């Protein structure tokens, strides 16, 4: 309908509550393994943020897996920063992690993160 | 970290993608039954929006149910409008549905919706 009203803060409040569920380990349904570091998450949030996870969890066989192992070249801290960004909209981008975050965002197909990483790197060159 | 950058549109893009998953029936894990009308949804989104669903899906027995039957006094159209609001931030509030939406929001413990309904009713009195 064209007659709707909108609650401005709704989407951020939903994201804040999904993050709360993740911290309390409520209804998490997948473990992402990155070089033996394990991260519990919600498949729907991963699919909503990452082109790679969207492709994974829409596959008729992988949709049922409770563990997903990422490529061993992926940095666990880079993945952690990206998972926090998925659940909070905030990216902890630092000189010491930018290359790992950018490489991880390229792999996860998170184009907005790749774009800001490219801009920060270009600014330092 | 206090050094984070934030992507303003992230939370709304996540919500838009969760709604897309719902429309395509991807990874929906519960059917909410309202007077024999059935609504497929994601438990995490319901818990993130509604105090009632948060209480339901954090219960050690109900967390495992794939069907939840609501009170027969709940109006299916009112529930539909609220479920759409959960997934989009947009509330289709109309003269013909406001009482049903308000009663449903009180039952689902969705205080911001109850508040706008009270304001619209008070304005017409």
């Amino acid at each position: 309908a064209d007659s709707c009203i909108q609650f401005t803060r709704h989407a951020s409040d939903v994201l804040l509550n999904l993050n709360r569920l993740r911290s309390r380990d409520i209804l998490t349904d997948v473990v992402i393994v990155v070089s033996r570091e394990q991260f519990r998450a919600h498949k729907t949030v991963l699919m909503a943020c990452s082109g790679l996870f969207y492709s994974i969890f829409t596959d008729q066989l992988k949709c049922n897996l409770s563990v997903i192992n990422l490529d061993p070249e992926i940095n666990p801290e880079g993945f952690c920063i990206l998972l926090d960004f998925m659940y909070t909209s905030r990216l902890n981008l630092r000189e010491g992690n930018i290359m790992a975050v950018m490489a991880t965002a390229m792999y996860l197909q998170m184009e907005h993160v790749v774009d800001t990483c490219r801009k920060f790197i270009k600014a330092s060159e | 970290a206090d050094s984070c950058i934030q992507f303003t549109r992230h939370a709304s893009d996540v919500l838009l993608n969760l709604n897309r998953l719902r429309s395509r029936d991807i990874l929906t894990d519960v059917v909410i039954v309202v007077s024999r009308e059935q609504f497929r949804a994601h438990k995490t989104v319901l818990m993130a929006c509604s105090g009632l669903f948060y209480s339901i899906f954090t219960d050690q027995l109900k967390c495992n149910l794939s069907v939840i039957n609501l009170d027969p006094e709940i109006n299916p159209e009112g529930f539909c409008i609220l479920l759409d609001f959960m997934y989009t931030s947009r509330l289709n509030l109309r003269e013909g549905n406001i009482m049903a939406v308000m009663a449903t929001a009180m039952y689902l413990q969705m205080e911001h919706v109850v508040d706008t309904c009270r304001k619209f009713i008070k304005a017409s009195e």
Binding site: C4, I5, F7, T8 | -
Partner: peptide
């Protein structure tokens, strides 16, 4: 909050 989107 509420607005006209």
């Amino acid at each position: 909050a509420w607005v006209i989107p």
